[PDB]
C-alpha cells in the first residue's frame, strides 16, 4: 500500500486537505475536468490543488511505455489545464502529480473509456460508440413510481448457464439476444423477462469494478463477481463486452443494451456503489488529491462505516461534484432510467436531495432508490441518507426491510419463521407493508412520508433467497407447502403500496443452494439456471398472473399516503392471515371495491366480509369454496395457504 504523502501546505497557503477551511477554497464549478476529444485537440483538466505539478502521461497501447509526457499549467480554483494541438485519438493517458516529495500516476477520476481492466484513460470520440438509432432511442411511459416492476439481475447471472440459449453468455449483448430458448423450448433471457411484465431491468454494478474481483484479461478461466468493489465510475465494466480490450466496445454494447430493452418497453436502473471504492490507498482519487476524496476520522484513519475499508467524502465539495457529474454522465451519455444507490446512509442528505432535482430537471421519472441502512461513520446522524431521515428526502425510494423481514421471517436468524410460515404475531408487520410504510394511524407507521418512499421485497442478490430461507425455517414442510408460502410472499409484495421489487428467478423459486452471501461464489452458484425455469413453468405463470393483476388495478399503486390513508382499510382476520380492502374506485379502480387476504393458515376457515356489496373472485379462486354476499352476512370459504382477491363491481 506504500507511503500515502498529504501534500507540502505551502502550496495551499498552509492550509491543509484536512482542514475545514480547504472547503472553502478551490472550488471550481466548470463543466469541462477530465478530457474532452476532437480530431483538432484534445483539452485537459485536473482538480488536483494540493499538487505542485501536474503531466498528461500519453500511452500508445494500454500495456506500452509512455511516448510523451507534457506538463500541466496551473489554472483557476486548485484545477490544472492541458491542450494538445494533434489528434489523440486512439492513444491512452495518466495525470502523474508530485504531492509532497510523492510522485503519483493515476486514471483519469472523469474518464469516460479505458483499456483493459482500467488502468490507463483512453481517448475517443464517444458519438463514434452510439448505436445506430440512438437519436431516437425512447423511453417507456412510467407514471408513476408507484408503477414501476423491477427485476434485479446480474448480468452474468443472466446468461452464463449452458442451457440458456444465449450466444455471448456473461455479456451485456446477451440481454439483447431476442427469441433465446432454454430446457424444452422455454423462453430465456430478454424474452422470458418482457413476458413476465415486470418494468424495469435493475442491473447490478455495471460500472468498472475491479481487477480483483474479475481480471478481465483472463477472461477465460472461471471467474464471478457482483461486482461492488468500483474502481472507474463513469465507464461500463470491461468484463461484460466481447473485447475488453478495445475501449469502444463495452461502451458500444451498454447503449445497444439499453436501446433494446427500451424498444421492448424495460426501462434500466443502474446499481451505483458511491459509497466506497475498491482500494483507499490505490484509488485514483488518494493518488490525486490525497486525504480529500474519502472520509477520515479525528486520528487521520479511514472512516470504515461501509465494512469495505473506506468512505467517499460525499459531503465535500467536490466529491458531490463528482458524484453528481457522474449520475448526470450515465443519464445523459447512456440514457439510464434510474439509480439503486448502494448503502445510501453513507450518502449525506444535501448530495442525494441534489441529485434529485438534477434529475427533476431532466426527466422526473427517472427512479432514485437505495439502500437506507442506519450504520455508523464519521458523517453525521442528522446529515446521513437513511430511513430516519426520510422525511427529508421526498421522491427517494428505501428499501422496506421490516415489510420484508415480517412476511418471510428474519433474514439474519435463518431458522426463524415469520406471516408465510405459521410464524405468530407477523400480521401487523405485514399490514405496515400493505400501508407502503407511511403512517397510516396508531401503531401502523413506518418510515416513508409517501409510498413512492417505499421499496417492497422478500428477494434480492444479499441474503438467502426466498426459497432458500423458506427452506431453512420450515423443517417440518414438504415442497407442495413451501411453494405455497413462497407464492404467498410474492403475491404480499405485488398487492401491497409503494414499488414491488423482485429478484430475477424469484418467478421460479431460485436457489443458491443455501449460500447466504454469494458475492464471489462461482456460477454454478450464482447463475440464473434455466433448467429449473422449466420446471416451473406454472410458478412463472402464476408471477405473471400476479403482476398482470397489479398492472390492471390503480387501487394497488396509490401515489400518496393521504389516498392510502382515506381508501386502504384493515378487516377483521384471524391470527396467521391479513385481511384488507381499497374502497371506492381507489387510484381510479375500475372497480368498486377491492377485498384481499394473505391467508398463511393452511386449513379451513370462514370469514367475515364487509358487506360493501356483490363480491365476486378476481384472483386466488383456486383457494375459495364458496362465496356469499349477502343482501345485495357476507362471509367467504377458503382453504389454503395463499392469496385471494375479491372485487365489487362498479
Ligand atoms: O473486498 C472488500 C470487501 O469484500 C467483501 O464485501 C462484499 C460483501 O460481502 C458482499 O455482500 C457485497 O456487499 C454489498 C451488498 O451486496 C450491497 O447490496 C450493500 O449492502 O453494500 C455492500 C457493500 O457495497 O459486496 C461487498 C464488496 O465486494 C467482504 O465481505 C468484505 O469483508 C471486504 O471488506
Ligand atoms: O461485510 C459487510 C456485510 O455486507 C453485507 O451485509 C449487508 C446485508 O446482507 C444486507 O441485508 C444489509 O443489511 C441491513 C439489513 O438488511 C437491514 O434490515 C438492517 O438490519 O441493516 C443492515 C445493515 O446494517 O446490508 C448489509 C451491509 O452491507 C453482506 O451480506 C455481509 O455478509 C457482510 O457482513
Ligand atoms: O391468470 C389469473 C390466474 O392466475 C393464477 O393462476 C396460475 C396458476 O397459479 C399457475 O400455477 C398456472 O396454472 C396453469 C398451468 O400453467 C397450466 O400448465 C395448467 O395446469 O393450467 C393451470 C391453470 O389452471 O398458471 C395460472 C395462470 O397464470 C392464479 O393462481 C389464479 O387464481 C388466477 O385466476
Ligand atoms: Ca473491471
Ligand atoms: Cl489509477
Ligand atoms: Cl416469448
Ligand atoms: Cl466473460
Ligand atoms: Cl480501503
Ligand atoms: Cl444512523
Ligand atoms: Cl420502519
Ligand atoms: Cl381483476
Redesign the pocket.
Given at each position: 500500500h506504500g507511503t500515502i504523502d498529504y501534500g507540502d501546505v505551502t502550496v495551499t497557503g498552509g492550509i491543509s486537505v484536512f482542514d475545514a477551511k480547504f472547503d472553502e477554497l478551490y472550488v471550481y464549478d466548470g463543466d469541462d475536468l477530465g478530457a474532452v476529444y476532437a480530431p483538432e485537440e484534445t483539452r485537459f483538466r485536473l482538480w488536483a490543488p494540493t499538487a505542485s505539478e501536474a503531466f498528461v502521461v500519453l500511452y500508445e497501447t494500454e500495456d506500452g511505455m509512455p511516448v510523451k509526457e507534457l506538463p500541466m499549467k496551473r489554472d483557476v480554483q486548485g484545477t490544472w489545464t492541458l491542450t494538445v494541438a494533434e489528434d489523440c485519438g486512439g492513444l491512452f493517458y495518466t495525470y502523474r502529480v508530485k504531492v509532497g516529495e510523492q510522485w503519483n500516476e493515476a486514471v483519469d477520476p472523469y474518464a469516460k473509456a479505458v483499456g483493459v481492466n482500467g488502468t490507463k484513460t483512453a481517448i475517443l470520440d464517444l458519438r463514434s460508440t452510439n448505436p445506430e438509432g440512438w437519436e431516437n432511442d425512447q423511453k417507456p411511459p412510467l407514471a408513476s413510481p408507484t408503477d414501476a416492476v423491477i427485476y434485479e439481475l446480474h448480468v452474468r447471472d443472466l446468461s452464463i448457464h449452458p442451457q440458456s440459449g444465449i450466444r455471448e453468455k456473461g455479456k451485456f449483448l446477451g440481454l439483447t439476444e431476442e427469441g433465446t430458448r432454454g430446457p424444452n423450448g422455454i423462453p430465456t433471457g430478454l424474452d422470458h423477462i418482457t413476458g413476465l411484465g415486470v418494468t424495469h431491468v435493475q442491473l447490478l454494478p455495471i460500472y468498472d469494478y475491479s481487477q480483483e474481483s474479475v481480471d478481465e484479461s483472463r477472461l477465460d478461466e472461471p471467474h464471478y463477481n457482483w461486482g461492488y468493489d468500483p474502481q472507474n465510475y463513469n465507464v461500463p465494466e470491461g468484463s461484460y463486452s466481447t473485447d475488453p480490450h478495445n475501449p469502444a466496445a463495452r461502451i458500444l454494447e451498454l447503449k445497444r443494451l439499453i436501446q433494446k430493452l427500451h424498444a421492448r418497453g424495460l426501462r434500466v436502473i443502474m446499481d451505483v456503489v458511491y459509497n466506497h471504492v475498491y482500494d483507499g490507498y490505490l484509488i485514483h482519487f488518494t493518488k490525486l488529491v490525497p486525504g480529500y476524496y474519502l472520509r477520515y476520522k479525528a486520528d487521520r484513519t479511514f472512516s470504515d462505516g461501509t465494512f469495505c475499508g473506506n468512505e467517499c467524502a460525499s459531503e465535500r465539495p467536490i466529491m458531490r461534484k463528482y458524484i453528481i457529474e457522474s449520475i448526470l454522465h450515465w443519464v445523459r451519455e447512456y440514457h439510464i432510467d434510474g439509480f439503486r444507490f448502494d448503502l445510501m446512509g453513507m450518502i449525506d442528505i444535501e448530495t442525494m436531495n441534489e441529485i434529485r432535482r438534477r434529475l427533476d430537471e431532466i426527466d422526473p421519472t427517472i427512479l432514485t432508490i437505495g439502500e437506507g441502512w442506519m450504520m455508523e461513520t464519521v458523517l453525521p446522524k442528522e446529515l446521513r441518507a437513511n430511513q430516519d431521515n426520510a422525511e427529508k428526502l421526498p421522491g427517494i425510494g428505501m428499501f422496506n426491510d421490516g415489510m420484508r423481514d415480517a412476511v418471510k421471517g428474519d433474514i439474519f436468524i435463518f431458522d426463524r419463521k415469520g406471516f408465510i410460515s405459521g410464524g405468530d404475531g407477523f400480521e401487523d408487520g405485514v399490514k405496515r407493508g400493505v400501508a407502503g410504510g407511511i403512517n397510516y394511524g396508531g401503531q401502523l407507521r413506518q418510515f416513508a412520508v409517501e409510498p413512492v418512499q417505499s421499496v417492497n421485497y422478500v428477494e434480492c442478490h444479499d441474503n438467502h433467497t426466498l426459497w432458500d430461507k423458506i427452506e431453512l425455517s420450515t423443517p417440518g414442510a414438504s415442497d407442495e407447502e413451501r411453494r405455497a408460502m413462497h407464492?404467498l410472499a410474492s403475491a404480499i409484495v405485488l398487492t401491497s403500496q409503494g414499488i414491488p421489487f423482485l429478484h430475477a428467478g424469484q418467478e421460479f423459486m431460485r436457489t443458491k443452494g443455501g449460500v447466504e452471501n454469494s458475492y464471489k461464489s462461482p456460477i454454478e452458484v450464482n447463475w440464473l439456471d434455466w433448467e429449473r425455469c422449466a420446471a416451473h413453468?406454472?410458478?412463472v405463470?402464476?408471477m405473471?398472473?400476479?403482476i398482470?393483476?397489479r398492472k390492471a388495478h390503480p387501487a394497488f399503486r396509490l401515489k400518496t399516503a393521504d389516498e392510502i390513508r382515506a381508501h386502504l382499510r384493515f378487516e377483521a382476520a384471524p391470527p396467521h392471515t391479513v385481511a384488507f380492502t381499497l374502497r371506492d374506485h381507489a387510484g381510479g379502480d375500475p372497480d368498486r371495491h377491492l377485498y384481499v387476504l394473505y391467508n398463511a393458515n393452511p386449513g379451513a376457515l370462514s370469514l367475515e366480509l364487509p358487506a360493501l356489496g356483490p363480491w365476486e373472485?378476481?384472483?386466488?379462486?383456486?383457494?375459495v369454496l364458496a362465496l356469499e354476499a349477502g343482501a345485495s352476512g357476507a362471509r367467504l370459504e377458503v382453504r389454503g395457504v395463499?392469496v385471494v382477491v375479491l372485487a365489487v363491481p362498479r
Open positions: 407464492r413453468q406454472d410458478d405463470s402464476y405473471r398472473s400476479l398482470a393483476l373472485v378476481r384472483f386466488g379462486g383456486e383457494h395463499g
